[PDB]
Amino acid sequence: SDGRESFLEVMRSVYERYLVGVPGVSEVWLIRHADSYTGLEDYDGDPRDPALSEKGRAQARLLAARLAGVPLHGVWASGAHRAQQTASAVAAEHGLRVRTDARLREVRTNWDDGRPSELKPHGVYPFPEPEKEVAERMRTAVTAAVAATPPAPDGTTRVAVVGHDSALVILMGSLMNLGWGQLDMILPLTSVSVLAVKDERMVVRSIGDATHLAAAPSDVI
Amino acid sequence: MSDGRESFLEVMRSVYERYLVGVPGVSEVWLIRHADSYTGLEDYDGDPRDPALSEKGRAQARLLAARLAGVPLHGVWASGAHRAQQTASAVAAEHGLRVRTDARLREVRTNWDDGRPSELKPHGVYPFPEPEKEVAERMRTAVTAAVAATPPAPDGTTRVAVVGHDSALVILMGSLMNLGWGQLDMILPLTSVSVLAVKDERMVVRSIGDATHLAAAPSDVI
Numbered sequence: 001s002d003g004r005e006s007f008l009e010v011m012r013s014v015y016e017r018y019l020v021g022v023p024g025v026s027e028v029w030l031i032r033h034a035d036s037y038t039g040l041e042d043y044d045g046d047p048r049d050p051a052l053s054e055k056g057r058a059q060a061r062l063l064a065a066r067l068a069g070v071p072l073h074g075v076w077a078s079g080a081h082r083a084q085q086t087a088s089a090v091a092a093e094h095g096l097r098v099r100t101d102a103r104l105r106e107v108r109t110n111w112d113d114g115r116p117s118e119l120k121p122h123g124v125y126p127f128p129e130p131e132k133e134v135a136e137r138m139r140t141a142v143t144a145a146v147a148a149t150p151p152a153p154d155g156t157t158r159v160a161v162v163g164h165d166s167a168l169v170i171l172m173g174s175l176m177n178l179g180w181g182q183l184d185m186i187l188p189l190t191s192v193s194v195l196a197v198k199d200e201r202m203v204v205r206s207i208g209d210a211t212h213l214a215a216a217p218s219d220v221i
Numbered sequence: 222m223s224d225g226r227e228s229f230l231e232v233m234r235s236v237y238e239r240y241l242v243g244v245p246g247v248s249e250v251w252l253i254r255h256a257d258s259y260t261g262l263e264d265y266d267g268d269p270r271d272p273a274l275s276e277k278g279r280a281q282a283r284l285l286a287a288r289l290a291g292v293p294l295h296g297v298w299a300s301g302a303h304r305a306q307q308t309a310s311a312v313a314a315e316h317g318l319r320v321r322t323d324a325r326l327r328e329v330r331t332n333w334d335d336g337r338p339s340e341l342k343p344h345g346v347y348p349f350p351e352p353e354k355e356v357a358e359r360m361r362t363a364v365t366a367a368v369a370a371t372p373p374a375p376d377g378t379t380r381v382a383v384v385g386h387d388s389a390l391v392i393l394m395g396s397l398m399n400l401g402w403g404q405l406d407m408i409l410p411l412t413s414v415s416v417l418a419v420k421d422e423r424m425v426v427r428s429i430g431d432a433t434h435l436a437a438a439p440s441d442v443i
């Protein structure tokens with residue numbers, strides 16, 4: 001009667017389907033690296049592996065401060081300098097060593113292949129590395145980072161993973177059985193997206209949050 | 222030909238502009254799900270379909286309000302539901318803002334609202350009697366109205382907080398990406414923040430579902 005018990009039981013079941021209120025769940029905080037594109041036209045190093053810009057260092061500082069109070073049990077990054085440098089800022093607040101996994105690299109691009117870049121229409125896949133290959137290597141890398149992180153003393157075990165926009169979007173789309181273009185988003189620099197992980201299950205919990213930049217100066221956002 | 226960095230950066234800028242990044246005149250809507258009522262409190266003292274926040278919910282709203290205290294905010298709107306009003310009041314109080322109400326932000330009409338048992342539907346099966354695109358329309362109209370009712374910021378980005386409900390917010394955000402129920406397959410955490418970027422009537426979904434201000438909280442608040 002009254003329909004309240006039915007409502008509450010369904011609410012609980014829905015939460016549990018998305019790993020909310022479920023014991024044994026870990027978190028993966030997928031982080032896009034900070035800016036390395038400001039000044040890239042005049043960069044005097046390898047332009048496909050730049051250091052962070054001045055803007056990027058400021059973003060990484062704000063991100064590191066945001067995550068300083070968050071329980072963090074490991075930090076992983078692709079091998080790119082921009083990801084390493086963003087990851088090092090996060091990790092230094094927690095005394096953690098940054099681990100590298102090449103499977104976290106950005107999708108191969110036209111530029112990597114020595115071809116002109118092209119702006120594609122919405123829904124048209126723009127990269128020479130197939131989407132399925134990106135999704136597989138990204139998922140394997142995240143699973144491995146979780147497995148390499150030991151259970152937190154109390155509460156949720158949490159690993160930060162610093163990667164690259166398109167590979168991170170492909171991963172999160174693929175976890176929802178969606179193809180490139182459906183989850184139609186560019187992840188902000190230094191944004192945080194959260195996966196909830198238990199056993200073979202990876203749930204997309206949140207996507208793209210760079211709200212630590214909201215109060216920042218105009219030359220930083 | 223030679224060095225492809227300029228071609229790369231020209232395309233990168235064109236992509237950013239499509240999603241309202243690096244574009245002047247963009248405002249933001251911070252879509253917030255209200256704090257807990259149903260998972261935290263033992264008994265219900267008013268309308269079971271429209272409860273006040275639980276003790277857990279009050280704790281979540283405090284952490285949300287602290288998180289947003291340092292963010293420039295220029296308006297706060299909320300559904301009429303008591304749990305949304307209470308959450309909005311906590312946020313607004315750190316900014317000297319008055320909570321405004323728009324009933325078009327109400328949750329989707331449910332089976333329980335119609336007096337019927339609830340059902341856990343298979344993934345992909347819409348569970349509510351109120352039609353999905355009608356929810357999407359009233360939610361997008363309400364957000365448009367809230368942006369229109371917000372005085373412009375004195376500097377930087379104008380930002381309006383909008384406190385609503387999981388399913389109506391997921392419907393809005395899916396609709397803004399041309400997705401139907403079940404494609405954006407997410408439940409928004411209590412007190413989560415999602416951000417829309419808005420310019421000349423266009424709304425872009427920039428972030429979804431963040432309740433990372435609860436990560437450091439005691440386990441009974443999460």
